[PDB]
Design a protein around this ligand. Structure first.
Ligand SMILES: [Mg+2]
Lengths: 209, 229, 50, 83, 230, 228
RNA sequence: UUGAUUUGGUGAGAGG
């Protein structure tokens, strides 16, 4: 019961199972800014049950705790505004399952998703070694206030833009975007508008469009 | 599959999921329940006059909760030969082997939505139900006599109000077929002395919906509620 | 034989058709590949993992 | 709003003490009694704390000065209420 | 401001479903703008009637089977989801299909009312094989737009309906395919004008000039928010 | 069968020539319809007037060089193209500017009539090195719509203009850049909607909301025929 | 004071 891979040290004291945590399949969502990730509404209402309970008890809509648990068990029309008011500035720890270095746990801000899949900003994928061929990630909620500040000030995804192993940037643009740039900034010996003169980059885009 | 290899036929026949005809001939096609094949005389025995009645296995549970289902692919009054197929199983189309479906695919980057290996799908794929698969879940409920008397199969579900007695009979167990979801009640199965009464009544798991397609009951010689047994 | 079968049907021989964009109504440059691939749905469904 | 805390890291140059100073401040605003030194754009107490840090009006020294001022106010309140 | 205005000059019907339409005259550069805008609106937001609830007698759930037929009940619900109906007065009607005897059950066997028109008299639904078999289904045809599915319409429905009514998904949009072309207009004094040749492909239930008029009204009333307020 | 009308929620006026019309909420796949329609109209159809032709002494084609100036005649052509002028009554006005002395020549130095005016008088034209240098250009202003460049202008012209006339791109439409996004807004049940964010930067002679309203009424009067 | 059992352990297969 002590020794081995499944004793108390390696199985219950160094690594523990954890409340306020979730897990689902990832997908892209390229509209994101790189400090935020998409997080489904069903997972968001399950991970944030006590914050929603506290918010519901503050407004005065209900009285006892039971009433609030019936309200979110029924999922009425008023708890989604409560949920968008508990999400807003509250980071979450996304984590891909084989975490090898410290860039495999990064903190985002949730943006709620109609769906059942974590939308993860693409550049950040090169840090997680996360493709989208069936991968899964876990979300963890920093409960206390010092942990929200550690997620925003140390573990936020804007703060991890250089790999700690060296000086090389880890938010390097991976595959589609370098093809879009390499096709954009290139040249050919004859095209429409060869050798005309332009009074700025704004009318360069206006001539392209 | 529009681009196959021709080995689809041998796999779909040789795996016994389709109802390959034993003796050739014509057809009577009652089929709602069974394909009825009249046998040509050369393949037909002198005694045992004989017409072959094939059993179609309709909607039932596979080992991976998928749906194994056979559908007749021959009409009424139509010649079939020995070794020919009659009923298409799961993932078969006229005796071939149809695992997935063939769709119009463009190779291009489209606004980042297919970044690493992702795939961007129109709404015409989801409107046509052309991947809408059917899963079947078996759920057991037993009322074993753990301790303090035996447990009981009654609708007279406690504490919980007229949110128990609903998808059931006038006095117990899920009726037959409705659109049950999560948190419903299927089989009222609770004991007294277990106020001190409780709710072990097997319910529907969290997050799933569905239609009760079948209810089996080889229960403790006595299950009859009123006089249904 | 793929090219010859694409010539029996009235399709372009290269396998590639010019495609417009549904958002902007304007042509994608450098014609893209359209065809029919036999795509399968594997039983790793997302509302068994969430 | 908030994306990066870089100016707050500039004005409290340790990057590990930023969390502690902003946590002490956000506990002064959450339970807390106190009201913020900065206009709030429906930000939470975390972002209001860090947003106070960025404009250079909360650090460790200001919080200890304010708590000595509150300790002296409680001392004067106890002395002037009893005696 | 030397602009002009277009009109629907020639409306040719190639068939009852596939039908082109011209637009003339358009200004320079406006052709792809109006064509792409009318394409997006005409594919997203057109009203058309479709099958919503199917009520077969003696059939509890949709995964059962029935006496005397070929297609199973999921096949019947798919073949009913493909139906193309055109009501005139009401917005919610109930049809009736009753038929016995050996042979296929076309869509032309539905005992129509006066204001419903079934525009596909060769749409097959069932293949009745037993002469002692019968089938009596009662369809319900609503009218809307877009795509509203069975899951969302599982609690959305307010009118407490009884149990036994199979819910079919609603494919409301009767436009399936639309392409526009910007040709060179044949104007006797202008060479810098163009025509728009919209090539619709409908469900047979929608009238193309009516569809274009409705899409134009949708676009104009959407742009009134830009016109009036700022 | 009733559609969602929006409210124009924001005009974040960054500068006098900048705007950001945040706009919400629209039906699913309508933000791209409105945005693309307005963008194509504002790019290639909005009416207005600017400089098209200019006749300068001392030059014979576009690759010569006059004395007394730091910049060259390609630079005077480009800085002329950057000038935003508005004409009220007529539509073909020729203007002439003459400048001598140590100092740059600005837009306020031009000779103007009663019908024309300059929206940015401190917009630079050129600079002058010599106090004896006397620059002279005959600036013609037509009025069209949208954008026509000098390349297809010299391809389309055939009449032999006198030597010294210079072609320039005719920035008729007064907007300089329009580019939008479509974000996702939320009405309390349906999350499938979408919110428009139109960005716009113009020159002088107009206010970005006036350009948006002009393009919208252009398209509405274009579609005014076959409606109900 | 208003309710309940898998983890335990084995074997087999699968995903990243
Ligand atoms: Mg992978």
């Amino acid at each position: 019961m002590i020794k081995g891979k499944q004793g108390r040290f390696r199985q219950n004291l160094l690594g523990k199972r954890v409340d306020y945590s979730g897990r689902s399949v990832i997908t892209v969502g390229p509209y994101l800014r790189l400090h935020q990730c998409g997080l489904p509404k069903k997972m968001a209402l399950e991970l944030f049950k006590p914050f929603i309970y506290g918010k519901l008890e503050l407004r005065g809509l209900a009285t006892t705790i039971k009433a609030a648990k019936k309200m979110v068990e029924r999922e009425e029309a008023v708890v989604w505004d409560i949920l968008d008011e508990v999400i807003r500035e509250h980071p979450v720890l996304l984590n891909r399952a084989p975490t090898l270095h410290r860039l495999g746990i990064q903190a985002f801000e949730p943006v709620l998703i109609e769906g059942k899949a974590i939308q993860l900003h693409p550049l950040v994928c090169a840090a997680y070694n996360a493709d989208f061929d069936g991968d899964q990630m876990a979300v963890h909620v920093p409960l206390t206030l010092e942990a929200q500040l550690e997620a925003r000030a140390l573990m936020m995804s804007t703060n991890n833009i250089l790999s700690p192993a060296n000086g090389e940037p880890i938010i390097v643009p991976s595959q589609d975007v370098v093809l879009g740039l390499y096709y954009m900034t290139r040249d050919c010996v004859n095209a429409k508008g060869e050798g005309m003169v332009l009074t700025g980059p704004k009318e360069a885009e206006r001539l392209y469009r | 599959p529009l681009v196959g290899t021709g080995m689809e036929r041998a796999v779909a026949v040789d795996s016994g999921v389709t109802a390959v005809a034993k003796r050739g001939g014509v057809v009577q096609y009652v089929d709602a329940s069974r394909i009825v094949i009249k046998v040509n005389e050369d393949e037909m025995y002198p005694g045992e006059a004989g017409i072959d009645i094939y059993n179609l296995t309709k909607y039932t549970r596979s080992n991976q909760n998928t749906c194994i289902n056979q559908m007749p692919c021959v009409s009424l009054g139509e010649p079939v030969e020995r070794g020919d197929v009659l009923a298409d199983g799961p993932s078969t189309d006229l005796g071939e082997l149809a695992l997935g479906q063939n769709m119009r695919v463009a190779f291009m980057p489209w606004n980042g939505y297919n970044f690493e290996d992702s795939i961007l799908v129109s709404e015409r794929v989801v409107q046509e139900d052309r991947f809408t698969t059917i899963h079947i879940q078996e759920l057991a409920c037993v009322s074993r006599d753990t301790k303090l008397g035996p447990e009981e199969i009654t609708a007279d579900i406690p504490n919980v109000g007229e949110a128990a007695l609903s998808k059931l009979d006038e006095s117990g167990i899920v009726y037959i077929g409705a659109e049950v979801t999560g948190g419903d009640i299927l089989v009222g199965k609770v004991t007294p002395k277990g106020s001190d009464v409780k709710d072990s009544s097997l319910r529907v798991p969290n997050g799933v919906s569905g239609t009760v397609i079948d209810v089996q009951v080889f229960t403790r010689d006595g299950v009859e509620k009123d006089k249904r047994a | 034989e793929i090219k010859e079968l694409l010539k029996l049907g009235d399709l372009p021989t290269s396998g590639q058709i010019r495609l417009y964009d549904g958002r902007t109504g304007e042509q994608f440059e450098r014609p893209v590949t359209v065809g029919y691939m036999y795509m399968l749905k594997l039983n790793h469904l997302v509302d068994d993992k969430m | 709003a908030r994306v990066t805390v870089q100016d707050a890291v500039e004005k409290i140059g340790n990057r590990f003490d930023l969390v502690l100073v902003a946590a002490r401040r956000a506990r002064q605003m959450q339970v807390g009694g106190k009201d913020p030194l900065v206009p709030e754009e429906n930000d939470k107490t975390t972002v209001i704390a860090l947003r106070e840090i960025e404009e250079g009006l909360i650090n460790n020294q200001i919080l200890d000065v304010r708590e000595r001022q509150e300790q002296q106010e409680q001392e004067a309140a106890e002395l002037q209420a009893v005696t | 401001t030397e602009f002009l205005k277009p009109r629907l000059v020639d409306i040719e019907q190639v068939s009852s479903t596939h039908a082109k339409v011209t637009l003339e005259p358009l200004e320079r550069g406006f052709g792809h703008t109006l064509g792409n805008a009318l394409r997006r609106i005409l594919l997203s937001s057109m009203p058309g009637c479709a099958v919503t609830e199917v009520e077969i007698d003696g059939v509890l759930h949709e995964y059962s089977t029935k006496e005397g037929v070929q297609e199973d009940i999921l096949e019947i619900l798919l073949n009913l989801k493909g139906l193309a109906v055109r009501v005139q007065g009401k917005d919610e009607v109930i049809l009736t299909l009753n038929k016995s005897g050996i042979g296929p059950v076309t869509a032309a066997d539905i005992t129509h009312d006066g204001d419903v028109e079934i525009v596909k008299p060769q749409h097959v639904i069932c293949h009745l094989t037993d002469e002692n078999a019968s089938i009596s289904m009662r369809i319900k045809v609503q009218r809307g737009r877009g795509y509203v599915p069975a899951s969302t319409r599982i609690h959305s429905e307010e009118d407490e309906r009884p149990i036994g009514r199979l819910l079919v998904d609603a494919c409301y949009s009767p436009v399936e395919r639309i392409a526009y072309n910007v040709e060179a207009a044949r104007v006797e004094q202008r060479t810098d004008l163009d025509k728009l040749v919209i090539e619709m492909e409908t469900n047979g239930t929608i009238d193309p000039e009516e569809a274009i008029r409705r899409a134009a009204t949708i676009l104009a009333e959407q742009l009134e928010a830009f016109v009036d307020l700022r």
